[PDB]
Paper text:
The henipavirus matrix protein (M), which drives viral assembly and budding of the virion, also performs non-structural functions as a type I interferon antagonist.
A structure was resolved at 2.1 Å, with the complex of HeV M NLS2 bound to IMPα2 in the P21212 space group (the same space group and crystal form as M NLS1:IMPα2). Here, we found the NLS2 peptide bound in the minor binding site of IMPα2 (ARMS 6–8). Whilst density at the major site of IMPα2 was present, it did not correspond to the HeV M NLS2 sequence, and subsequent analysis of IMPα2 crystals by mass spec analysis revealed this to be an E. coli contaminant (30s ribosomal protein) corresponding to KKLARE. An additional notable feature of the M NLS2-IMPα interaction detailed in this study was that the NLS2 peptide 244RRAGKYYSVEYCKRK258 did not bind 244RR245 residues that have been reported to be part of a functional bipartite NLS. We also note that the NLS2 region undergoes a conformational change upon binding IMPα, since region 252–261 is helical in the full-length context, but linear in our structure.
Author numbering:
A (entry chain A): 255 to 259
B (entry chain B): 72 to 497
C (entry chain F): 58 to 63
The structure:
Amino acid sequence: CKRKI
Amino acid sequence: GTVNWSVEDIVKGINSNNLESQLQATQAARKLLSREKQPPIDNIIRAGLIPKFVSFLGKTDCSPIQFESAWALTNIASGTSEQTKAVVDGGAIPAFISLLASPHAHISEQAVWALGNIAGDGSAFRDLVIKHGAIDPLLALLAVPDLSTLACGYLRNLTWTLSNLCRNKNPAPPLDAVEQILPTLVRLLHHNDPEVLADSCWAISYLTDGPNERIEMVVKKGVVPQLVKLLGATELPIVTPALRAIGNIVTGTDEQTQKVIDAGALAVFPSLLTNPKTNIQKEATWTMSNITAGRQDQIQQVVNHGLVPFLVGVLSKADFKTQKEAAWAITNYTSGGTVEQIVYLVHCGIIEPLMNLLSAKDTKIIQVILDAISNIFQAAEKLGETEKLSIMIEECGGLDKIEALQRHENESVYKASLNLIEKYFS
Amino acid sequence: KKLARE
């Protein structure tokens, strides 16, 4: 999934 | 004249009852504090001079001592958090905000600079500057038909100070403050000065570093096409924040990610993924990994732009931290991709460089790679070509690496490797 | 960040 920072 | 004064002489002059003597001593303090080598900030603070400087900010009849005290305090506030706190503790925030409307441009600019240092300390001083009402007078200095009529240095300082008001998390800036600043910020993001552009990009990168609601506030203002343009600039100080902002935006929704793709961002990644600056390459691969975590039609755009060969390259040779982001981009790709998209990955040569990275000591990349290998086998099961894949992996030495990983001390690692061995290599 | 003047 999307990985912030 | 006012060069190389001692602190004790500065104190004597400021404690005099004589404004011109006070002005001369304040200049002497400014010059001390503006020396490159070990300016005696702490000595000036211990001498108790901050409350005097702050009082001088209010001397409307003596604009020189306003300027000199503002500059002195700016340089104190440029130091440690404790030194910045001493400036704030002296009442400097409301004093500086009142100076933003000064008819003397060099005094207003110094006040802008000082507030940037104070806000830049951290979220608490940032929000305290906002609570004291700094935003309205700051934005009024930029409410002109054409930014090009402002002095370049002035405009750069205003942009940098607004960027500090956008900076830092826990908490992020107040939502109403961001909404108040954004229209001016988008105007600065279209300016032609490289330094204004760099700092405007940094501000946008801060505002997009957070929950998807924060990203939406920015994207809604239509800045993505300008960001993609700046992504192709020649100035590395522009590319770096532009890429960070684009990267943050694609951590959001598939719809927010689609605006980056629609704006043409993918056409820039052939260069970004080969950029000689290791940090640009790493951040570009991290950005790609969040794009390949998207929808199948978005993966398909990655393919159409010819970027899978570039991911194979980074996996083959790059700084290890960049290679780690590439493994993530591949696993995300294989997780959400069609069978045909996953097959194409193998035709582009992903297996050998992916296998060679299983020799890495980092435990997390090994789990990521093994999960990608599983997803690729699963796509091959649906075509009945698992054997041909197993042969690729054996010929390049991957089977030896997966077998050795059954002895790995980490639990999930030696678990996944065994499953592949028994399921496809038996 | 923070910047000193001269």
